[PDB]
């Protein structure tokens, strides 16, 4: 993993928290903006193994839709994981702050990118376990990069909740939920239902209703991500292929799924 000298890093502002340290925005000289996760004095052996292990896995990833590791500081303390900086931040907040501002084709493009990143992770034998819009970063080209900021009942497949079976197929369930987040501009899955009410609804066969203005093909795809039987869900290769074909024949997205009105307004 590329080792960066501390003199090349300037931490500027705190942007969040890590396992045993803080996360910062800063600048890297070689200035490019970067995000910086630190491991502070007193960290345990297990925290060090997990921190350096995370850096090592991130260093093996090279994909347009996966956050890119700039380097690591391991030879000096505090230790640091340094990534590219994504100007538009996390996707859930981004869409909530830009409600209605994008075209259907732009939104589906986002999903294609997320799906390509997930196909790569799954092929690399990396199970994400926490896929949600809050863990996707957006750059100034609208490119979505799968990330993981650490800690999700509403996003998690039934077998993962029930007996802790996390696989790329439970990640597919989560991707379905991410599709719904994107097409709703960041609505909260299942709205005010409690965690127990969500699981009961899922077990009894209910599923999230179609978003407003949602292409029929897109709702059909998210519905197939939520099959109870794990083996029946599409693989990420299937998802990428479908999304790529829909984008390349964009008239395919003009057919919309019926939106079930929660409210009726009667006017003459
Ligand atoms: C520094 C860093 C370290 C680790 C990871 C990461 O994704 N690790 C990872 C991903 C995979 Cl797919 C697999 C495995 Cl093994 C590990 C990401 C970053 N970078 C960012 N993080 C945050 C941030 C904010 C608040 C709280 N925590 C983080 N904001 C950012 C970043 C870039 N731009 N912005 C606005």
Tokens of 51: 């921190």
Measure the CA–CA gap between 84 and 211, rounded to whole angstroms: 32
Measure the CA–CA gap between 78 and 204, rounded to whole angstroms: 50
Whether omega before 78 lies within 30 degrees of 0, making that bond cis, reads yes
Q: Is the CB of 67 under 6 A from ligand 1?
A: yes
Query: With 0-12 CB in 10 A as exposed, 13-18 as middle and 19+ as buried, what is 157?
Result: buried
Nearest to residue 33, comparing CAs of 89, 116, 109? 89
Structural domain span for residue 161: 89-253
Active site residue 50: no
Q: Is the CB of 22 under 6 A from ligand 1?
A: no
Measure the CA–CA gap between 236 and 146, rounded to whole angstroms: 14
Q: In Å, what is the CA distance from 150 to each residue of 6, 97, 231, 246?
A: 25, 23, 27, 32
To one decimal, the resolution in angstroms is 1.5
Q: Is residue 262 part of a domain?
A: no
Which residues make Cβ contacts (< 8 Å) with residue 171, sequence separation at least 6?
Answer: 118, 121, 122, 127, 128, 129, 131, 236
Distance 177 CA to ligand 1 centre (A): 21
How many domains are contained in the chain?
2
Q: Which of 70, 147, 174 to mutate to test the pocket of ligand 1 (most atoms within 8 A of CB)?
A: 147
Nearest to residue 12, comparing CAs of 38, 30, 35? 35
Residue 29: count other Cβ atoms within 10 Å of its Cβ. Answer: 11
Domain boundary, last residue among 84, 109, 132: 84
Q: Is the CB of 58 under 6 A from ligand 1?
A: yes
Does 176 carry a binding-site annotation?
A: no
Distance 215 CA to ligand 1 centre (A): 31
Measure the CA–CA gap between 176 and 106, rounded to whole angstroms: 17
Measure the CA–CA gap between 12 and 26, rounded to whole angstroms: 5
- DSSP for the chain reads --B--GGGEEEEEEEEEETTEEEEEEEE---EEEEEEEE-TT--HHHHHHHHHHHHHHHH---TTBPPEEEEE-SSSSEEEEEE--TT-BHHHHHHTTTT-S-HHHHHHHHHHHHHHHHHHHHTT---S--SGGGEEE-TT--EEE------GGGS-HHHHHH----HHHHHHHHHHHHHHHHTTSPPTTTT--HHHHHHHHHTT--PPPPTT-BHHHHHHHHHHT-SSGGGSPPHHHHHHHHHHHHHSGGGGSSBPPP--SS-----
- CATH, residue 194: 1.10.510.10
Query: With 0-12 CB in 10 A as exposed, 13-18 as middle and 19+ as buried, what is 251?
Result: exposed
Measure the CA–CA gap between 247 and 268, rounded to whole angstroms: 39
Q: Residue 138 pairs with which residues in a beta bridge? A: 144
In terms of domains, do 155 and 196 share one?
yes
Nearest to residue 14, comparing CAs of 25, 30, 6? 25
In terms of domains, do 27 and 143 share one?
no
Q: Is residue 261 part of a domain?
A: no
In terms of domains, do 191 and 235 share one?
yes
Which residues make Cβ contacts (< 8 Å) with residue 127, sequence separation at least 6?
Answer: 121, 166, 167, 168, 170, 171
Query: With 0-12 CB in 10 A as exposed, 13-18 as middle and 19+ as buried, what is 2?
Result: exposed
Distance 156 CA to ligand 1 centre (A): 20
Q: How was this structure determined?
A: X-ray
At residue 197, what are phi and psi to the nearest 5 degrees?
A: -65, -35
Q: Is residue 141 part of a domain?
A: yes
In terms of domains, do 229 and 130 share one?
yes
* Catalytic site residue from 130, 204, 213, 258: 130
């Amino acid at each position: 993993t590329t080792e960066i000298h501390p003199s090349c890093v300037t931490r500027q502002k705190v942007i969040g928290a890590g396992e045993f340290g803080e996360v910062y925005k800063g600048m890297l000289k070689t200035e490019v903006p970067v995000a910086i996760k630190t491991l502070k004095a007193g960290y345990t052996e297990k925290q060090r193994v997990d921190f350096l292990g995370e850096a090592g896995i991130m260093g093996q990833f090279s994909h347009h839709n996966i956050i890119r590791l700039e380097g690591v500081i391991s030879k000096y303390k505090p230790m640091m994981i340094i990534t590219e900086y994504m100007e538009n931040g996390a996707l859930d907040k981004f869409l909530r702050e830009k409600d209605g501002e994008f075209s259907v084709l732009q939104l589906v493009g986002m999903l294609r990118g997320i799906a390509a990143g997930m196909k790569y992770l799954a092929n690399m034998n990396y199970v994400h376990r926490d896929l949600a819009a809050r863990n996707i970063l957006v750059n100034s080209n609208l490119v979505c990069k799968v990330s993981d900021f650490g800690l999700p009942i509403r996003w998690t497949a039934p077998e993962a909740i029930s007996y802790r079976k996390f696989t790329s197929a439970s990640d597919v369930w989560s991707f379905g939920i991410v599709m719904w987040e994107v097409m709703t501009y960041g609505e909260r899955p299942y709205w005010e239902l409690s965690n127990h009410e969500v699981m009961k609804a899922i077990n009894d066969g209910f599923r999230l209703p179609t978003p407003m203005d949602c292409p029929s093909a897109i709702y059909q795809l998210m519905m197939q991500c939520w099959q109870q039987e794990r083996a029946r869900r599409p693989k990420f290769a299937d998802i990428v292929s479908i999304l790529d074909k829909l984008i390349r024949a964009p008239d395919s997205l003009k057919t919309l799924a019926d939106f079930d009105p929660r409210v009726s307004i009667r006017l003459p």
